[PDB]
Design an enzyme around this catalytic site. Structure first.
Site: not given
Ligand SMILES: O=c1[nH]c(=O)c2nn[nH]c2[nH]1
Ligand SMILES: O=c1[nH]c(=O)c2nn[nH]c2[nH]1
Ligand SMILES: O=c1[nH]c(=O)c2nn[nH]c2[nH]1
Ligand SMILES: O=c1[nH]c(=O)c2nn[nH]c2[nH]1
Ligand SMILES: [K+]
Ligand SMILES: [K+]
Lengths: 300, 300, 294, 294
Positions: D6, D66
């Site tokens: 992130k 994330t």
């Molecule tokens: O495609 C995704 N990957 C991830 O790692 C993730 N983490 N939150 N949303 C997400 N969407």
């Protein structure tokens, strides 16, 4: 470390040699580049042990002024007889090291400045203009080239990469993100149908460096074709994450282009939030600033 | 002055009512908007004498929170049954003044967030995707609407404008700028063949406000059609200045769209410099920051 | 409408005549400007009926090239003998209309490019450098001027405004926003102690245009002093809204500077969301426009 | 390569433990940080072999979302009891690897969000406010940390760096650039007195990672002190190039801070063109990368 150079060296010229004779793939109608209008933004970085005293003593005797590097790049676009941004970087790099034998390493980045065709009516005929072009701020081709002069005074490429940058794709349905860890730090709900918005930067490495230059253009891999693979694969697949999407795009790239050794992805997640008010059509809006990202390499 | 509101209210939705039944012009193949994916960025500003004490005393009794204005806009995109960004603003404005009778004036700006079609291969068939779209950072449609509640409590539109923003056009030859004042402040050389690079923002005003809403779509003037007039006129004409170019674009717009009252231009000059090194193909590069600009209105 | 001109005309000058003898106010230490380094970004717009054919026919005979306007501005910063950005715009405007008789109107915007002092050691003594300055991307002074040629060939100022732009202020406590309308569209919670984060652009108009030029510096109102009034009033007051804050800032400005006729505010709300820890909000931002008059 | 994470995780905290007891140097008044308001922008990246199937199969069973990493960072700023941005990254990194055993590597970047004090009048006395702060878009402190889990389950720091970013310095005189190569590609005139304008990013590495955490604050090296060394050295020296300037800045840093192992520079040249009056150049900018080691 000990490097210096010039960034944001823009250079535009008309009637570069057209790129034709390319090899097609199912995902892309790309058939070449007319090159009536070509633009590139170049960054150059050089080094060499003989540059030490320019730092330690203020002795500029062996300093190529960075302004002169700018001139060198721009002048070489005027004389470049090739058809690709990769070949342009090779021309600059080889020419620069031959000119300045005390330079041991040069690194070049080239970013295409893309222009789009427009149409005009001439005597009742609406047809592609050879004169008026639209500047695009969307995706663009890139290239990276490093070259060295070895101790024995021979010249070698030491890294070469091609790429596609600035691609922003949103798929309105047909994406899930479920099954992730749900613990005391998790507030994200499971979502079986989200409108996934991804930024994609894609880079590829050729098995044989000559294939990147356009000399035998059937072996060239165009950023346009990579773009079109990415959009097709995104459409074709119920996505399960960005991680799994970029894996599938990479596999398709390496299947379509057996002359490539590997493909590298930098993706970001910019998916919109469902609005606060309850729903009528569903409505989405911009999220808070934090963005997810992924870095992943697929090899043959 | 006494106004307050909310900016950067983004709202995205799928399957807005398509725009069809438009009236075509020679310069443009535009035939409507499928509206599978629609995005808009809205700014709202409101005022009223009854808001005085929210400033003078800190009394929020009559304050619609700006967060609530955001909710209002986003919710109304979910229920909007029309086909144009102008009609969306009218829907928001009329609904807002009916809800909040102590508000005397509302001003709305809408900027389209443009998306471009992509293509995908399904079972050997490469065809336009209904799912995957590319976000564009190039030109976009705009709309402006002001509405008031009069002292007698009736409602009226007080200014309405449509537009096209962010168009960046470069014409590589067929442009001159000669004959300007040459005095003690002049260092610009005469140039009979320059690669004129213009930024264009174009706005138009309808004779009859109803024609802007799409209700009878044959009377609508699409930003896409205005764009295509601009590119055609630029191509067709040996330009003598940006001033004269925008005059000719405006004349063509008013000829093609007799339902328009006037057209307004904000242009900027971003033409590249010839490089320092002598020329091989001529090469151009980015100029210093100062940019020329022009503001001009053409009326019927 | 029929105007043309040049934007982003940057000009940097060393050793402008110092601004000295300004009246100091309790909210601000400001007592002048050394002007060792002075930068401005100017936008010029001009018009006149005799420019019509430059649009309608492509006749450039009466066109001052916008590139030449850039030269004019930059050269006049070299010859400017005054002490303020407002006076520099006046000098450019008067000079330009005197030079080009076919121009009937000129509009100028000037934005100061702010620099800050830095520390250097000289013979063991740490002090502000007279040579090295830090380029600031924070708040900056502005000025605006419109001038016309009348049919009797007199020149007249028709608009004049000074300003402070880009001020970003956050107050960690002592701010409420309560009592607003709650209906079907209201989800915002009432908040008795928010960390209000406001962006402020503040503009003012003088009763006497001569006071803006620094000719009598005791009557000059420095953007630095306006900034410091804004921060003092924000600190002093339990705020009830941005609307009421900018009202109180404006009242204090007019009280401190009776030579001012009006103050104008453009504010934006950029307050962080609570997750004590806060984070950046979604993009939509509130804003307010408001005038206080003397 | 196989990482995810992130970016742009902003977190704002009031009343962090103050940083006090730092050693002061002659170039800088810096003597600690009150930490009434503390903001950071964090980027987190993680990897591990057990994440492979999240890419190859779409299996999210071992994926920390994330979004959850964002929550983790923000919550840990609420519980952080230390005094430095470097120590905050250490706390996040150790905490995250202890929580998630399948993660083998974590990389963190932290950028301080800088705030400046403002003036307020309290009972007639003008003084710095304890409530109202100004958000700065100028230079800012940075920190970097990479940590890994070994096969014996010990945690190890593999990379650690501190920094100062976004410093923009112009020196009006006392700078030359002469004696460089003149050949077919050289049009740049020699210049014996240019107004050198440099952008500086400066990074440093400690000999002892514990010194970066503030645990013993006498050994902490503040970005503010590095900034003030840079401006002092720029002032003191007739510069002969940006290359030689950053060499001298780096030598002074290492002399003032013997606890540092190395200093790294990323500089850019943004010097104005002469039209005395100067103006903005065309876009191409020079740059230099250079390391000095202790
Ligand atoms: O495609 C995704 N990957 C991830 O790692 C993730 N983490 N939150 N949303 C997400 N969407
Ligand atoms: O088209 C142009 N109009 C102008 O007014 C101008 N001024 N310099 N160059 C120019 N080009
Ligand atoms: O100060 C404020 N004024 C407003 O109008 C407002 N609306 N939402 N939050 C707000 N805060
Ligand atoms: O300080 C400088 N270093 C350089 O390498 C250079 N090149 N052009 N100007 C320059 N200035
Ligand atoms: K072809
Ligand atoms: K159609």
């Amino acid at each position: 470390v000990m490097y210096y150079g010039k960034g944001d060296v823009f250079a535009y010229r008309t009637y570069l040699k057209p790129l034709t004779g390319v090899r097609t793939i199912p995902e892309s109608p790309f058939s070449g580049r007319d090159h009536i209008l070509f633009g590139v933004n170049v960054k150059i970085s050089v080094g060499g042990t003989k540059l030490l005293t320019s730092f330690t003593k203020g002795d500029n005797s062996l300093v190529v002024a960075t302004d002169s590097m700018k001139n060198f790049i721009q002048k070489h676009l005027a004389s470049y007889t090739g058809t690709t941004i990769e070949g342009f970087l090779e021309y600059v790099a080889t020419s620069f090291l031959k000119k300045y034998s005390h330079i041991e390493k040069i690194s070049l980045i080239g970013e295409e400045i893309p222009f789009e065709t427009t149409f005009a009516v001439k005597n009742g005929n609406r047809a592609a203009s050879e004169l008026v072009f639209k500047k695009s701020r969307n995706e663009y081709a890139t290239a990276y080239l490093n070259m060295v002069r070895n101790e024995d005074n021979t010249l070698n490429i030491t890294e070469q990469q091609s790429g596609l940058a600035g691609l922003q794709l949103i798929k309105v349905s047909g994406n899930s993100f479920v099954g992730f860890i749900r613990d005391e730090y998790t507030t994200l709900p499971e979502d079986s149908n989200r409108p996934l918005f991804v930024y994609l930067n894609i880079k590829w490495k050729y098995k044989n460096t000559e294939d990147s230059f356009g000399t035998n253009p059937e072996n060239y891999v165009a950023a346009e074709q990579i773009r079109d693979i990415a959009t097709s694969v995104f459409h074709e697949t119920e996505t399960l994450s960005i991680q799994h999407l970029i894996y599938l795009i990479g596999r398709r790239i390496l299947e379509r282009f057996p002359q490539l050794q590997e493909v590298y992805f930098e993706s970001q997640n910019h998916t919109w939030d469902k609005i606060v008010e309850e729903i009528e059509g569903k409505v989405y809006t911009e999220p808070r600033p934090p963005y997810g990202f992924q870095c992943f390499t697929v090899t043959q």
